[PDB]
Amino acid sequence: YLPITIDHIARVEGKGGVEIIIGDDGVKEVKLNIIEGPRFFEAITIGKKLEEALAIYPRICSFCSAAHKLTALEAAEKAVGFVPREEIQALREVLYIGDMIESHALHLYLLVLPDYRGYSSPLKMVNEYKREIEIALKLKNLGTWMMDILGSRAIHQENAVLGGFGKLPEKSVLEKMKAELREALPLAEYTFELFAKLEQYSEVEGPITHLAVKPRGDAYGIYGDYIKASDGEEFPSEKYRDYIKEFVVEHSFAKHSHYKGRPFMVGAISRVINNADLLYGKAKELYEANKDLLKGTNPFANNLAQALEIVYFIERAIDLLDEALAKWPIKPRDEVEIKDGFGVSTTEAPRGILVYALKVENGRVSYADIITPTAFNLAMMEEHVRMMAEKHYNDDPERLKILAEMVVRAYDPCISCSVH
Amino acid sequence: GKVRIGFYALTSCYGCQLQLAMMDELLQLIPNAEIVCWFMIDRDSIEDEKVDIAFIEGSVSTEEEVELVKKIRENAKIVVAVGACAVQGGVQSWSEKPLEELWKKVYGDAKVKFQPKKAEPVSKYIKVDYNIYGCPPEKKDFLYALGTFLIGSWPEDIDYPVCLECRLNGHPCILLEKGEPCLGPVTRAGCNARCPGFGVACIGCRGAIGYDVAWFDSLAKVFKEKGMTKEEIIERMKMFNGHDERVEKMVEKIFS
């Protein structure tokens, strides 16, 4: 009856808010109200032909068009029984890594750092911290450029198609890339050492359940057929319903999710906690020297795990462009018989796990189930804000309203994703 | 006095903002001006500031977004509709499925404190003075309106189809030669014909234009020997122009 309402959260993707309920005991409930209109991407596409429903899923969210679209892809292709050609996956992993490289570098640098430096806007430390932001746009624009080469674009990639790609580039470009990647690994190196010196607050330390796709071969990756949880459990990616369940609350247009009847966290610390040993390159050594910072016990270690992965994914697409280039010349796409069937895929989107589940019958989409990572995260997010609200509630409100948000901004919430 | 520009947001993928965001000297690109409300970038942002330019992005899908678009029509001398979600209602308009059947098919019967509505252009409730097109728009389309608006002038809209630029680049008709249904002869241009030029079909994202000039020798002939029926063209034009009432007879001139 005297709430703390943060009508909008700055420097996150989407339209949302907070209603932290203060009592007489301290903190009752924390409510992240999420107001971003459903766009019913799960229903308006129903009865629509596959291809046509597929060029539309990326418009759920511009921070992760590749992810959605390259995930839509894998699940329409288990459905119609296709299998990718080998160098054609390596390219899809590459394109996913410039969605990844850029997302983090845009969340970290233009959404997270402003709070630990004093600035409301990133458009502000422009002539005060020039080198960082020049480091910022260099990582981001190897991101932005990679997507503009293998996907026509960064926001909603129309070249990645059923079967592969509509025009793969000249060889020299996958070489120049690998040349621009190698001229990037020192830039993410800087970003590791910057976000590790930063504060992972004490009011949030506490036990968390961490879930992640498991890499379908020898290395830390994105694609894979087995969701792992931090207890030491594993369950088939095809039974995500039979192991995690949804529920509507009146205080959001986004569902909420439980593993084992309780909150869990996906989104990069989750991947390091679960699949840390599958790493190599400068990133293995950076985890094996900075691990009292990469524990599953603090939200904000999401931010430094991002920095680590820009080390990994930079180096791995170096190898992955190399693998592709050993099958050159490559036919762009192969023909896909659209036969009926069902398919689930689970991939590591920039923020945790994205599930696409597609049913097609007679060329058109009869069913679909999507759950995005910010939606998965909404519910431990609220608890970690409560935990901060506990140890700070009878503060000057504006001293409080800053620190809960940083927590929100530590998940990299992407609300156009949690509501589709 | 530095021209007031706010970037407000409705129901979107924030790509149209992402686009302004990833333009890197952006603040060297709008100097006689000041950014007063862009929550994605400024926490020092307030909605009830009177502004000069009003870049509204996204559909009106929740009721309070009817309160916002009316709110901004009042504190803004210029309200500019940015992207297909705000220009056309977007890809969330390509089903006429009533809201409730869409609520039930996703939420079942589970109530949300907030009021959802079917998707609608910004134009329905408040006056849009200009339109920047594309899903998302092109960097070159944002450079144009901001810079022109800011020297005092008024922007204009490319009224020719994607096929003109298509041809310029030397791009071969993936329609004529490959049987993909290109919405290029009926989609406004600006993209440097990105999708023909990737062996992909135009999917409409920059908006519906009309086919009032005979750019193809017989599009009806191409559409009657590719197997593209007037209803087909309509389901597809409707993925980004599902509120255009002009569609139904525009495709009908083509086949008449």
Ligand code: SF4
């Ligand atoms: S028009 Fe497209 S890119 Fe722009 S906000 Fe809407 S969905 Fe996102």
Ligand code: SF4
């Ligand atoms: S591919 Fe499409 S845009 Fe290009 S010339 Fe053919 S119809 Fe026109």
Ligand code: SF4
């Ligand atoms: S070719 Fe059509 S769908 Fe492709 S970017 Fe241009 S307007 Fe959009």
Ligand code: FCO
């Ligand atoms: N990362 C990301 Fe977007 C969300 N949630 C997806 O997938």
Ligand code: NI
């Ligand atoms: Ni997203």
